[PDB]
Design a protein around this ligand. Structure first.
Ligand SMILES: [Ca+2]
Ligand SMILES: [Ca+2]
Ligand SMILES: [Ca+2]
Ligand SMILES: [Ca+2]
Ligand SMILES: [Ca+2]
Ligand SMILES: [Ca+2]
Ligand SMILES: [Ca+2]
Ligand SMILES: [Ca+2]
Ligand SMILES: [Ca+2]
Ligand code: NA
Length: 427
């Protein structure tokens, strides 16, 4: 018969094999008994127990024959028997209990609930306290060996809120992609064993792009000078807008706003390249339009897209592309007849010549001269065009005088237009 009915023993988790759990004696014959004892396990409460322990059948010494895992099973209940060969006897049997004492063999486990596994992401300037990923820390031991706290690290714009079940990782700042497209976090964790076993976990935070900026122009108002009578399809000016966003959000497409210039349309005067290049679609003419301005848009692919527009002033410069035009006196094939008294004095105003020129400035300025003919008997004012007599006529003066007035301008190469004034002396 066994010394005690029930035995309780504490055994370290993960104790090596052949560790002495206990040496039982079935009270080997006291004052005699038939003798030749034999020990054996006859039953286990959990069958798992079968494979963790062993007993010498003759000496009666229980030892470890397996890995005692507290997280698997912590209590082992063994029914054991001692026998005298059944000559004329009963079997004695007691109940052994091995408590598996928990030790700190599991350190913390840090897990991220997100969709794209391990790719944590968040859109620019997402709001303060916007949850990005649920983190879950665990330690599979019991007690202090099971308890755990964890913390973010280094200054970053995020934080964690510890809860009963799990923690939560959220935004704690303003995120701008144009400034930073990524952060590099490290969650540090540890258990409360002695000494405490620690875990780190490092991972990335990809800040996803928003279409939060439009294409910025280099200038709000561009200007360019052109020369009059330019060729159709001749380059004028380049504008440029850049968008800091990603892809479609940041591509740039140029458009010219509908406007009418002098009664038609911008298109009919000007067009735009999808590269910010402005081409003259027509031959410009300073006498029609010395200046016109227009707006030019820029847009990007986003839902919905965004715009910036800039103004464009075109200065049309003057060239001397208008020869002057004789308009007084009226002209037949470019000549006029006038009459005058023969006894006319000196200074008599014969006629007054005048021309119009459309160009502006020097290009448009007129000077009058007698080019040829009876330049001796008449004189012309350089600015008026007033033709007057410079001599008296009498006694066998010819009765008819021919003079060629011209009006020329002041351009790089001066243009001009003549007229033939015939003078007849009416007595
Ligand atoms: Ca274990
Ligand atoms: Ca353990
Ligand atoms: Ca632990
Ligand atoms: Ca931004
Ligand atoms: Ca952006
Ligand atoms: Ca944009
Ligand atoms: Ca012109
Ligand atoms: Ca002119
Ligand atoms: Ca002109
Ligand atoms: Na023994």
């Amino acid at each position: 018969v066994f010394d005690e009915p029930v035995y309780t023993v504490n055994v370290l988790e993960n104790s090596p094999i052949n560790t002495l759990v206990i040496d039982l004696n079935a009270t080997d014959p006291d004052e005699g008994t038939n003798g030749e004892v034999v020990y054996s396990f006859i039953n286990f409460v959990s069958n798992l127990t079968k494979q963790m322990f062993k007993i010498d059948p003759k000496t009666g010494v229980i030892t470890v024959n397996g890995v005692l895992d507290h997280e698997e099973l912590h209590i082992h209940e063994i029914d054991v028997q001692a026998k005298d060969l059944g000559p004329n006897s009963i079997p004695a049997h007691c109940k052994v209990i091995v408590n598996v004492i928990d030790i700190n063999d599991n350190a913390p486990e840090i897990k991220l609930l997100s969709e794209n596994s391990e790719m944590v992401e968040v859109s620019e300037n997402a709001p303060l306290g916007y949850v990005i990923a649920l983190v879950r820390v665990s330690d599979n031991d019991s007690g202090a060996n099971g308890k755990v706290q964890c913390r973010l690290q280094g200054n970053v714009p995020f934080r964690l809120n510890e809860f009963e079940s799990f923690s939560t990782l959220l935004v704690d700042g303003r995120l701008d992609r144009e400034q930073r497209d990524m952060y590099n976090l490290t969650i540090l964790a540890e258990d409360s064993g002695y000494p405490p076993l620690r875990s780190s976990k490092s991972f990335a935070v990809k800040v996803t792009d928003e279409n939060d900026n439009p294409p910025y122009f280099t200038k709000p108002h561009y200007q360019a000078m052109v020369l009059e009578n330019n060729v159709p399809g001749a380059f004028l000016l380049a504008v440029s807008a850049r968008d800091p966003d990603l892809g479609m959000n940041g591509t740039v497409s140029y458009e010219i706003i509908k406007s009418e210039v002098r009664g038609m349309s911008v298109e009919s005067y000007v067009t735009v390249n999808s590269n910010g290049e402005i081409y003259g679609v027509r031959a410009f003419n300073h006498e029609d339009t010395r200046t016109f301005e227009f707006k030019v848009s820029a847009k990007d692919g986003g839902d919905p897209p965004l715009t910036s527009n800039a103004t464009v002033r075109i200065v049309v410069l003057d060239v001397n592309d208008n020869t002057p035009v004789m308009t007084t006196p009226p002209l037949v094939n470019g000549t006029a007849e006038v009459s005058i008294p023969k006894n006319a004095g000196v200074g008599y105003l014969v006629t007054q010549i005048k021309a119009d020129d459309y160009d502006e400035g020097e290009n448009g300025r007129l000077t009058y001269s007698i080019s040829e003919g009876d330049m001796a008997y008449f004189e012309i004012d350089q600015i008026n065009g007033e033709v007057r007599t410079t001599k008296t006529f009498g006694e066998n003066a010819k009765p008819s005088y021919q003079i060629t007035v011209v009006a020329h301008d002041h351009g790089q190469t001066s243009l001009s237009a003549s007229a033939y004034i015939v003078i007849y002396l009416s007595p």
